[PDB]
Write a protein that binds this DNA or RNA. Structure first.
Ligand code: TMP
Ligand code: MG
Ligand code: MG
Ligand code: MG
Length: 676
DNA sequence: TGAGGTAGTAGGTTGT
DNA sequence: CAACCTACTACCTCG
C-alpha cells in the first residue's frame, strides 16, 4: 500500500552565487607531515584557518576570502609543532550535481551551521546541538530542551536542515555542594578545571594535606601549585578509578570535582510522542531558518510503502511469542529444566510449574522438572552437583534469586556455563499476577534450553540470515555472528566469537563465522542455501566482506550484504493519518529507511537506515525480509526488537562474551541461546 | 536480574 | 573531521 511521509528535513534557500564559487587554498606544512598524520593534520588546519573552511582534496575550500583567514600559523599535534602556510589558489565554481563537489558544498554547509550557531544568544550551544529553554529543574540540576541539527546541500543546490529535538542534563554544582544536599555519590564525576571525567569510587576521608602523591607533593598543594584552589575550597578526598589502570585508584578532591548527571541521579520522562516531536521540529526549523538567514523551511516528502504484516507461528498462529506459552511452541522437544533457589525457600513455585506443564502439554512434548539442592557458596562440590544435573539430562536452569550485583551475577552465569548449563535469572520478590515478567523469564529459560518458540511463515529470497556485530569495552573486542536458518527461521544459532583489536572484523574471521552458519544450515537442511542474507550492524568497514563474498561465490551461494545502521536514519512522520509499523522508505541509490517497530504511547520511533552494499535482490524484498525477521525474536514475549533477529542475537552474544569471557563456552550447545 | 521500546549519560573506532 | 558504534540506567507498557 502506497503512502507518503515527511522526513525531519527541511529545504531552505538556494546557495547564493558566492557560496557556489568557494575559494581554494593549498596547504604547506613545515615540516611535512607523515603518512599517518597527514589527513588529520589537514583537518586541523581547516579549523585553525578560521572563517568557514573545510578540507578539499589535498587542500582547503572556504566560504571566506583568504584575507580574513588565518593563513600563517602553528599547529600542535601529539607533541609536535608544525608551522602552516596557506596559499590562495583562486575561486572555482562547484556543481551540486557532481556528488563530490556537492560533498564539499555539504561539508561547508555543516561548518556554516556550527559557526553561525556560535553567534546565537541567549541559548546553550554545544557544537551542532542548541538548547533554547528550560524543561525541568531541581536542587542543583536542570534539564534544557533544544535540538540536534545538521546542514547540507541538495543536488539542486539549496540548503537542507535536519532537526531533531533533544534534552540536555546540566549540573551547576561542585561535588561538595551536591553531596551536602543529601544526594548519594554519582557514578561519574568531572574535573572542575577541565573536560576530563572519572568514575567515582568512594570518599576517602584522610587528610588531603598529608596524602602523598606519586612524586612527593600532597594532594592539596599539588592542586594548589596548579592554581586550582584559587577561587574554591578543596573539600574532602575522593577516590576515582584510573581510566587507564583498573587496579590503581587515583586520589582527588570533592571541591574540584563536579557530578555528571544521568537519569539515575535525579520521575520526568524525556521521550516525545511523534506528533509533539514533529511540532517542535517544525518550530525549531523555522526559528533556525530565520535566525541564520537561511529562509523559510519547506518540509521534505518521501514516498513510503507499507510492508505486509508477518505471520508468526507457534504450534499454530500467534501474535506474540508469549502466546506460544498457551498455544504451544513451533518445535517442541523432550526437555529437562532445573530450579536453583538462592532465596532460602523450597521447591518450584506452583504457577511457574503449571505454566511450563501447560506449554509442554499444548506442544505435545514431555517436560522434566529438577531441583538443584546444592548452593554455589559451596565452591567445587556445587560444580559436582551441576555435573550430576547435566548428566541427568538437565538443559537449562532457572535461578530464583534476590537482585544480584553485576559481579555476582556474572560469576554465577559463568560457573553454570562452564558445565554447559545456560541460566535464566528471575528476581525473588515474585507475585503470580506479575505475569509479563515471569512469562518473559519462562521464554528466556526455554530459548536457553534450545526450544524454538516461534517461526515465520512467509516466502523470503534468502533461507539463511546472519548478523554480525562487535562487543566489549576493553582494549580489544569480540566479533561475533548469529543466524536464523531455514526459510522460516526455524532454527536460531550462535557461533563462537573471536577476539579482535577493534570494531573491524578480520576478513578470515568473517568468512570463518559465516562458514559455521553455512555448516549449521547444512546439518539442518542436508544441503547448501541458495542465497544468504548478510546483516552487518553499523557500517561495513572497507573490504571487510571481500573474502567472505568470494568464498560464497566459489560455493555457488548468492548473497546480499546489508549495512544496518541504528542511528543516522533521521525521523519519519506520516503526512496524513496514523503512524503505522513496517514502513519502507527508499532514498538515494542503494539506501533506504525502515521503520520496524512502533506502537501508540511510545516515544517517536527511530527508523533503521539500511545500505545495500552488495547483491542484486530488489530493495523492497530486502526490506520485507529484514522487517519480518524483526519478529522472529523468541525471548521478548510482548514487544518485537527494532533490529532483525540475527542482529539482535549477535549483539547480545558479543555483549555477554564481553561481560563473562569466552573461556566458559566450550560445552554450551550452539542451539542454546545463553545470552538472551 | 524481564523485555522491548525511546530517552538520557559517558567514551570509542574507522579513515579521508 | 567522519558517521557511525559501545554500554549503562530511567520510565512506559506489555504486538
Ligand atoms: C601529579 C599526580 C597526580 N595524581 C592524581 C591526583 C589528582 O587529583 C589526579 C588528577 O589530576 P590531574 O587532573 O592534574 O590529572 O591525579 C597522582 O595520583 N599522582 C601524581 O603524581
Ligand atoms: Mg555494533
Ligand atoms: Mg551491539
Ligand atoms: Mg535474559
Amino acid at each position: 500500500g502506497k503512502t507518503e511521509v515527511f522526513l525531519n528535513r527541511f529545504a531552505l534557500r538556494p546557495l547564493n552565487p558566492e557560496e557556489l564559487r568557494p575559494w581554494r587554498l593549498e596547504v604547506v606544512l613545515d615540516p611535512p607531515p607523515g603518512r599517518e598524520e597527514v589527513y588529520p593534520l589537514l583537518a586541523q588546519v581547516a579549523r585553525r584557518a578560521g572563517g568557514v573552511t573545510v578540507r578539499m582534496g589535498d587542500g582547503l575550500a572556504s566560504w571566506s576570502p583568504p584575507e580574513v583567514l588565518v593563513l600563517e600559523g602553528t599547529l600542535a599535534r601529539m607533541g609536535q609543532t608544525y608551522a602552516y602556510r596557506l596559499y590562495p589558489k583562486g575561486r572555482r565554481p562547484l556543481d551540486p550535481k557532481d556528488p563530490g563537489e556537492r560533498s564539499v558544498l555539504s561539508a561547508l554547509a555543516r561548518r556554516l551551521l556550527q559557526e553561525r550557531l556560535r553567534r546565537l544568544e541567549g541559548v546553550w550551544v554545544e557544537g551542532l546541538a542548541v538548547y533554547r529553554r528550560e524543561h525541568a529543574r531541581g536542587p542543583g540540576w536542570r534539564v534544557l530542551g533544544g535540538a540536534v541539527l545538521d546542514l547540507w546541500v541538495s543536488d539542486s543546490g539549496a540548503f537542507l536542515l535536519e532537526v531533531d529535538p533533544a534534552y540536555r542534563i546540566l549540573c551547576e554544582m561542585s561535588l561538595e555542594a551536591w553531596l551536602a544536599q543529601g544526594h548519594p555519590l554519582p557514578k561519574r564525576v568531572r574535573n572542575a578545571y577541565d573536560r576530563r571525567t572519572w568514575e567515582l569510587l568512594r570518599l576517602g576521608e584522610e587528610d588531603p594535606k598529608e596524602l602523598p602523591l606519586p612524586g612527593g607533593l600532597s594532594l592539596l598543594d599539588y592542586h594548589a601549585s596548579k592554581g586550582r584552589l584559587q577561587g574554591r575550597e578543596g573539600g574532602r578526598v575522593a577516590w576515582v578509578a584510573d581510566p587507564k589502570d583498573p587496579r590503581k585508584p587515583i586520589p582527588h578532591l570533592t571541591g574540584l570535582l563536579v557530578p555528571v548527571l544521568t537519569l539515575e541521579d535525579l520521575s520526568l520522562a524525556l521521550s516525545l510522542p511523534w506528533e509533539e516531536r514533529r511540532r517542535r521540529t517544525r518550530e525549531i526549523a523555522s526559528w533556525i531558518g530565520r535566525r541564520l538567514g537561511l529562509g523559510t523551511p519547506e518540509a521534505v516528502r518521501a514516498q513510503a510503502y507499507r510492508l505486509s504484516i508477518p505471520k508468526l507461528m507457534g504450534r499454530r498462529a500467534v501474535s506474540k511469542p508469549a502466546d506460544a506459552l498457551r498455544v504451544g511452541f513451533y518445535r517442541a522437544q523432550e526437555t529437562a529444566l532445573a530450579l536453583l533457589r538462592l532465596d532460602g525457600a523450597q521447591g518450584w513455585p506452583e504457577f511457574l510449574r503449571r505454566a511450563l506443564l501447560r506449554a509442554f502439554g499444548a506442544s505435545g512434548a514431555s517436560l522434566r522438572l529438577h531441583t538443584l539442592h546444592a548452593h554455589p557458596s559451596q565452591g567445587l562440590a556445587f560444580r559436582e552437583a551441576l555435573r550430576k544435573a547435566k548428566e541427568e539430562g538437565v538443559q537449562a536452569v532457572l535461578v530464583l534469586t534476590p537482585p544480584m550485583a553485576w559481579e555476582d551475577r556474572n560469576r554465577l552465569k559463568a560457573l553454570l556455563l562452564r558445565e554447559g548449563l545456560p541460566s535464566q535469572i528471575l528476581n525473588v520478590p515474585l507475585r503470580e499476577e506479575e505475569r509479563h515478567r515471569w512469562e518473559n523469564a519462562l521464554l528466556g529459560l526455554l530459548a536457553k534450553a534450545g526450544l524454538q518458540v516461534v517461526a515465520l511463515s512467509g516466502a523470503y529470497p534468502a533461507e539463511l540470515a546472519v548478523g554480525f556485530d562487535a562487543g566489549g569495552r576493553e582494549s580489544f573486542r569480540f566479533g561475533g555472528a548469529a543466524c536464523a536458518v531455514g526459510g522460516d527461521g526455524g532454527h536460531l544459532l550462535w557461533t563462537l566469537p573471536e577476539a579482535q583489536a577493534g570494531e573491524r572484523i578480520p576478513q578470515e574471521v568473517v568468512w570463518d563465522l559465516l562458514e559455521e552458519t553455512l555448516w549449521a544450515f547444512r546439518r539442518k537442511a542436508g544441503r547448501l542455501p541458495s542465497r544468504v542474507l548478510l546483516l552487518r550492524d553499523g557500517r561495513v568497514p572497507q573490504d571487510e566482506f571481500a573474502l567472505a563474498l568470494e568464498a560464497l561465490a566459489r560455493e555457488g551461494i548468492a548473497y546480499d550484504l546489508v549495512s544496518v545502521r541504528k542511528s543516522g536514519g533521521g525521523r519519519v512522520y506520516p503526512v496524513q493519518g496514523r503512524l503505522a509499523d513496517g514502513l519502507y522508505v527508499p532514498l538515494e541509490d542503494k539506501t533506504f529507511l525502515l521503520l520496524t517497530v512502533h506502537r501508540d504511547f511510545r516515544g517517536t520511533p527511530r527508523p533503521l537506515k539500511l545500505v545495500h552494499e552488495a547483491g542484486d535482490t530488489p530493495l523492497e524484498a530486502l526490506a520485507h525480509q529484514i522487517f519480518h525477521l524483526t519478529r522472529l525474536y523468541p525471548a521478548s514475549g510482548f514487544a518485537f526488537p527494532r533490529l532483525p533477529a540475527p542482529l539482535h542475537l549477535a549483539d547480545r552474544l558479543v555483549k555477554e562474551v564481553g561481560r563473562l569471557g569466552i573461556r566458559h563456552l566450550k560445552e554450551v550447545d550452539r542451539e542454546k541461546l545463553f545470552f538472551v
